Design a protein around this ligand. Sequence first.
Ligand SMILES: [C]C(=O)[N][C]1[C](O=P([O])([O])OP([O])(=O)O[C][C]2O[C](N3[C]=[C]C(=O)[N]C3=O)[C]([O])[C]2[O])O[C]([C][O])[C]([O])[C]1O[C@@]([C])([C]([O])[C][O])C([O])=O
Ligand SMILES: [C]C(=O)[N][C]1[C](O=P([O])([O])OP([O])(=O)O[C][C]2O[C](N3[C]=[C]C(=O)[N]C3=O)[C]([O])[C]2[O])O[C]([C][O])[C]([O])[C]1O[C@@]([C])([C]([O])[C][O])C([O])=O
Ligand SMILES: [C]C(=O)[N][C]1[C](O=P([O])([O])OP([O])(=O)O[C][C]2O[C](N3[C]=[C]C(=O)[N]C3=O)[C]([O])[C]2[O])O[C]([C][O])[C]([O])[C]1O[C@@]([C])([C]([O])[C][O])C([O])=O
Ligand SMILES: [C]C(=O)[N][C]1[C](O=P([O])([O])OP([O])(=O)O[C][C]2O[C](N3[C]=[C]C(=O)[N]C3=O)[C]([O])[C]2[O])O[C]([C][O])[C]([O])[C]1O[C@@]([C])([C]([O])[C][O])C([O])=O
Lengths: 418, 418, 418, 418
Amino acid sequence: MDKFRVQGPTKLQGEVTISGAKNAALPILFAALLAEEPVEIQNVPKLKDVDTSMKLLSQLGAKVERXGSVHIDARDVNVFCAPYDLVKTMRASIWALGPLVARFGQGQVSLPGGCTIGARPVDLHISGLEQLGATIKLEEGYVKASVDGRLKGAHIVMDKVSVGATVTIMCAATLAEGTTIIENAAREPEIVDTANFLITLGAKISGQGTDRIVIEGVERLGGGVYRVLPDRIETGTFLVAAAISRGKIICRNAQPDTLDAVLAKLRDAGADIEVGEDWISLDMHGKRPKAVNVRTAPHPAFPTDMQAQFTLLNLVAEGTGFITETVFENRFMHVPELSRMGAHAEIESNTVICHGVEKLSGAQVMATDLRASASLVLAGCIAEGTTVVDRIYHIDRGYERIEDKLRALGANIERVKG
Amino acid sequence: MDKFRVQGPTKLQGEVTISGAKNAALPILFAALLAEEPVEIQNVPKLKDVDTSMKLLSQLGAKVERXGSVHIDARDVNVFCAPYDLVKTMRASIWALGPLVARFGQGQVSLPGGCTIGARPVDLHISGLEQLGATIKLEEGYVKASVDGRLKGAHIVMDKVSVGATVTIMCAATLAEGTTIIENAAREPEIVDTANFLITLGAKISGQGTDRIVIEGVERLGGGVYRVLPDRIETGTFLVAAAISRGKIICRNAQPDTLDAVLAKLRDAGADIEVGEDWISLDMHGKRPKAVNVRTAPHPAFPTDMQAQFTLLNLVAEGTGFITETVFENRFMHVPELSRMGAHAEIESNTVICHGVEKLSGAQVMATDLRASASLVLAGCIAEGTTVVDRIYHIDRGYERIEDKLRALGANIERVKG
Amino acid sequence: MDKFRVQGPTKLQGEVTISGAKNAALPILFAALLAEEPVEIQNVPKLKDVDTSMKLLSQLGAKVERXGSVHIDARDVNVFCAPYDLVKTMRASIWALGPLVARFGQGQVSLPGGCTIGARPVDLHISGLEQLGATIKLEEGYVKASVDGRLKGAHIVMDKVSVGATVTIMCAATLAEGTTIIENAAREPEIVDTANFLITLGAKISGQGTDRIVIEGVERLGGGVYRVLPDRIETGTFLVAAAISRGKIICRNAQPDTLDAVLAKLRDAGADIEVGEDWISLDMHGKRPKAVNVRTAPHPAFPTDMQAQFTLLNLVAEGTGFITETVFENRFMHVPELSRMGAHAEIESNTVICHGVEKLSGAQVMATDLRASASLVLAGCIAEGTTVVDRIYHIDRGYERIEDKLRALGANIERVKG
Amino acid sequence: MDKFRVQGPTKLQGEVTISGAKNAALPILFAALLAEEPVEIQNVPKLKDVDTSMKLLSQLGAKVERXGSVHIDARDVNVFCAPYDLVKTMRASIWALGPLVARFGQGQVSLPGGCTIGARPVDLHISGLEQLGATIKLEEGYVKASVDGRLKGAHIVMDKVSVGATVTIMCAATLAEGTTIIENAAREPEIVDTANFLITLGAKISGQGTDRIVIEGVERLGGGVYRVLPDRIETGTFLVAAAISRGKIICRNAQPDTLDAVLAKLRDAGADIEVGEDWISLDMHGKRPKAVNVRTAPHPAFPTDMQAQFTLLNLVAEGTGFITETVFENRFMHVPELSRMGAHAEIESNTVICHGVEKLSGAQVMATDLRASASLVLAGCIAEGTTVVDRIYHIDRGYERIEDKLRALGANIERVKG
Ligand SMILES: [C]C(=O)[N][C]1[C](O=P([O])([O])OP([O])(=O)O[C][C]2O[C](N3[C]=[C]C(=O)[N]C3=O)[C]([O])[C]2[O])O[C]([C][O])[C]([O])[C]1O[C@@]([C])([C]([O])[C][O])C([O])=O
Ligand SMILES: [C]C(=O)[N][C]1[C](O=P([O])([O])OP([O])(=O)O[C][C]2O[C](N3[C]=[C]C(=O)[N]C3=O)[C]([O])[C]2[O])O[C]([C][O])[C]([O])[C]1O[C@@]([C])([C]([O])[C][O])C([O])=O
Ligand SMILES: [C]C(=O)[N][C]1[C](O=P([O])([O])OP([O])(=O)O[C][C]2O[C](N3[C]=[C]C(=O)[N]C3=O)[C]([O])[C]2[O])O[C]([C][O])[C]([O])[C]1O[C@@]([C])([C]([O])[C][O])C([O])=O
Ligand SMILES: [C]C(=O)[N][C]1[C](O=P([O])([O])OP([O])(=O)O[C][C]2O[C](N3[C]=[C]C(=O)[N]C3=O)[C]([O])[C]2[O])O[C]([C][O])[C]([O])[C]1O[C@@]([C])([C]([O])[C][O])C([O])=O
């Protein structure tokens, strides 16, 4: 589980180098199952979720190794089942299914539980791989998928916006016969990236980043080297860190165009923001943030994954702000913990009413999920005295060396026994 | 982390002896902090949360022992802080606060952080105590209370129904100057039980079990012996166990009039129910349950602690039924775990739409909270094949020897360490 | 249609005499169908709903006359249908069903369709009477209920708290063979009034006002005189009127023990409340009110029928308040109307975020339902300038002489035709 | 106001010619206020809301007339107030504000106005115009908006998706100084249509149909001739008529590509659907539809304007299906009216659970809003016996000649006084 001991108050200033998007790396690592020649994925973050995806890849008969690059030779994939002991730690492994069905005519993947931020069914994936020509059963907790021909292009209208299911259908439409159209498709940048990875293999895909994606099937996919775009959430995390610590950060190796909504909100909070080609800078000029109202929705709107972060921005901000969460049903678990640190918040349905306070007080708190965990470490940074954040394993899933990266911003953080 | 390996299918049938209410034993344990003479609480279940209560009682300087009975002598209580290490292992610990404030004019309890099943704030405990004349501050994650001398009785109209806040205010009001009226009090049998235990010590309480509790404050409370009432939720858990397994069960040492709503729904579901003075029989007559619609609400309505169990009943029942949870905002975490087992559910907000299936399949599942853990075990008993329920430590909080009791009904359960 | 022209701002001053409860008068008027000897119901407010009840009664064959009192002779009832044409104007007329079935073994009432404030099903009425041994179908949009002989007493556990269902089952149960127990009964004061009316007629009822009502069926009910309790919602409306206008008021012929939650909220808002045996005074002391947090729930909690009024209070209060409606789902139609008058509101799910303003401005607004109309009139009193409230007939359903009572408090109101 | 008498059951079959979209005609009519030379809008349906728009336009000092076409000469527009007496009967008149501010430097529009289906604030309309430079106050219930000179282009990020606020800002921006970007713009086909109308007048717009609309502002807009696209909601409504009545319809003058989601849900229901350039056919082949689950959301997802109709479809389909409504908080008022007809429906906050029945039964029912009115008329056609739908004024707002169109499909419908 272990813990970060964070000593605050600490003004966060300097630079950080933004890492590859965890949420691009993962779907790309499973889409690599489609490749019949070796793939090299660059700018991959050293995250627990990447390690797990790698152990799952090797489990399926891929040869995998890594250092910023991950090498994947899926030429001899000979196992088609992602075991429970892996999927239980990474629900993103559902992404193994579509590729394996589309290349190998079969795939078996443990049906994910059971998540704290919401229930997160995969009905859209394992519909989707059905409207394509897959037959799917569930036996002993394994989603068993087969096509005893080869996949067939379909006009698919997604009845919910889903990042996960759009990736699945997209990836598993690159080896279909015919055209697949995906209506009401997710447009997050990770999906644009996965698509552009797939074209590097020689897939035919149009309109990634839009609400309609067109895939004409191909016979097989090759190899190639692909650089994963920067993590927009980790970027938003370090930008927020400075916003709430009255600081100034320059995020380098970044993609500002992935962040229209979040940058608008930090400006709304009174951050001085300049954007270059591959960097975002932010200076509070010594100033407490101003309270903003926020409403999560699918890209290009404000991301649910910045929600916990902006909640904390508000709780230390000037005035009252409203954080409405529309994507996940139970994503306010940070709030009772921030409350222990002296935050004044109220939860009405999927809205938290945040009455900004000048300073938080250090306290022992419990991280509940990835983005919560980071928000608590941020809260620790700017709180008076000692904060101990428990269950820090959550952070290790989606942030590479956050302790290092925050320490270079002046943070006082020690990873502690547990 | 211990797990249960449950083997199915198996018909659950025979006889079970209901243990004391976990949820009467706990509030009475903290209420014993008011006692100035030794106290014996009889029929206390051997449960983890009782152990935790005992640790915290001892850490406040009470002398505490147990076998059936837990003996407390709070004469020499001399520490008034409930520390983070304890509270965070059970939030019920907030119940030390009213006693300490009322008897000692001071009390500190770690502000509970969030919970798997909901945010669970304690605003009403705090405001209730404020209305009794307490000053309360939050310093360093600790809820600090103090009064100049004695608390003062007040007319308190509760903003919402809260079992825990009703207990807090009721216990504190017993040593206040004057009359306290709690309007819109919770009416749970455990509140009747706690009030009757307080009466045994010498408190003057009227209207327990009703929406209006009247307490006449006394200078001092003494000792006494009180037997805790039967666990209604344990009772319902085993009643469900027979129902979903087309079985027959007799619960001894029950208290039927605590279960009006659960027995009405079980009847709705097709159960042949009979009651005596201290026993309930259920017989399905070898037939699959019929689906039911349930809406959780405070006592005497259908209790939220039976919700996960009935979600299960509905998911193997004939036809379609819904469960709406109005008490906790995130108590559907058993649902995806049952989905792995072949259940067909759809969560739309605070409602679970269930389409009953004839058979479940054994799968590796994850217990997330107490009542979910038991439902997962119960699903294990009726599924075909092997179910492993991980994180069984949850069950240990609120069930006394559930493995031995199910085994006696015919269950095939082994406790497995790794 | 008639409108009120209201001129403000007006400080609302003096005293009002509270009329009898619309919501005790109505169920009592229907219960009188059980009566085989003349009945006089005293203190009945002169209201459109009463006139409608009397019209329906005359149409079933009761002889009905009215001034203070309404006199009913149901000895000659010989028509057993409540037609659509009348139910459509007043859904309370579902209340004829239970009497007619219980006394005459048959009863037809048009199934109430939707309602401004929520869907309002009557599924709990039908189930209650079915549980008493009534066969019930729906043909041509009529609920048609029938028994052979008399009804039969039953142990009935109510799914949800229902005022209307509790009355329905309680009145029917008076002429049933055997004992009827209603668990999770509604505890509203109007239920107590209705039970006590039934008792005057020779019925055997205990536990009214508590969550379990027990009824011992008799062969036949008599007649009697019975005075209806004061209207707690009227009292609350006039207390709110004073509270929002910087006023002082005294409500004569009140019953303060019905208004615990309301008086407590007006206290949290900074009102000076005193009570007598039969009066309530409120005095703001030159004060504009202060924002509060309301959660509606069944009696004794804050009543949904005071919610529109308190929303009003919050929207002119100094501060930010939440009004949360748990009883009726769409009971927020006043909000956009008050918005026209300058209120800063914001509806989010089943809560309204009010951000109290200092002044309202007069505007042409539209009454949508009863309590909403009252709120808009009261808004008009404290708004600067002229407010015109259209569709004022809603108010006449449920308030006797509202305009006269307000004018005696110093309001400048004129009823207009077109 | 008058009523429809429908005699069922009728199998609806034949052809229908779809009218121009009410919801393109309407923003197009108000966009015409920007035009400095006469405009002819072609394919405008003859509907109450067009008449009202026409009346409002005339009042603002446009010369307007109609037959197929509506002609508008807005050259001499010189009254800049949309008054309460017109706006109260049509929400969409809020659309007069933007054009008047953009072209004349000022506009006044009565703030709507409260609506049955939800509260419907226009805060995003206000805030988008303030972001383009307007100063907006609210005075006696009128939104009064002024700018000195032209508006100034702005990057506007919309916090929620709003069709109305998208059109407001897009129209106003056409005369703004410089460039305007709408982020999180609605994508509805009517927004595309309005943009293309605007372009016909010499506006420079791109991105319409996507989440980001770019408007480069121009000096003046001219005139031209523009044909409104087909009504996708009328189309959907007759497609559902064919579906629920186990019939066959061909819709002529359709635009199949505006209905991906609806067509996919109708296939899910067992419909055999074929599409051409300008036609859709649906043939059920004598079959009862199968129950489907529906989630409304902004286009291209399932439209909320089809939800009542598909609710109706589920309520007569085979099986159980759920309709979740994510756009408008109170759009289930058709349900309790369908309940009078023998529908088995259950509403649980924002979801209706439908358990389809073979046949509905004719009954007197009351329309509450436009799409509800239409669904009750459809329910009428297929119900057994006689249905009288009251308050059919709702239908006349958004359907042209639905009675003649339905009769041509074989329906037995008479318009009646009742
Ligand atoms: C790995 C990744 O990428 N992640 C992410 C994503 O997730 P997902 O899961 O993919 O999501 P979606 O899908 O979009 O979701 C939404 C909604 O919908 C629903 N669903 C889904 C699917 C299906 O099939 N069905 C359904 O229903 C769900 O439940 C929900 O509600 O994405 C997201 C969004 O953005 C994000 O947030 C995520 O990320 C995270 C959260 C994860 O990872 C975990 O941790 C982070 O990162 O934090
Ligand atoms: C220990 C015990 O007893 N437990 C139980 C109880 O809990 P509580 O916490 O006490 O609850 P309440 O309070 O009643 O709650 C409800 C509601 O409300 C709210 N709140 C509260 C308080 C305050 O202050 N504030 C507020 O807001 C909350 O959130 C909720 O929602 O009770 C219950 C009911 O019946 C039960 O469930 C319980 O039990 C359990 C769950 C335990 O574990 C813990 O909780 C079981 O299962 O056992
Ligand atoms: C006439 C009278 O009394 N009224 C009143 C009453 O109402 P009701 O209708 O009776 O109500 P309830 O029943 O309680 O209700 C509640 C709830 O539940 C539901 N439900 C019912 C029944 C059945 O069966 N089912 C069901 O579900 C509904 O929906 C709801 O949600 O009472 C009330 C309460 O408190 C009141 O509010 C009333 O009053 C009024 C509103 C009138 O209008 C009537 O309408 C006023 O305002 O006055
Ligand atoms: C005339 C027309 O077009 N209509 C239509 C529309 O409406 P509107 O109003 O525009 O809507 P929206 O906006 O989209 O809405 C959505 C949501 O959001 C909200 N909001 C808005 C605005 C503002 O400012 N704020 C806010 O918040 C609201 O409330 C809601 O929730 O569109 C719609 C949608 O799709 C439709 O539905 C409509 O249509 C109708 C209904 C009419 O009539 C009305 O308007 C029909 O047609 O039916």
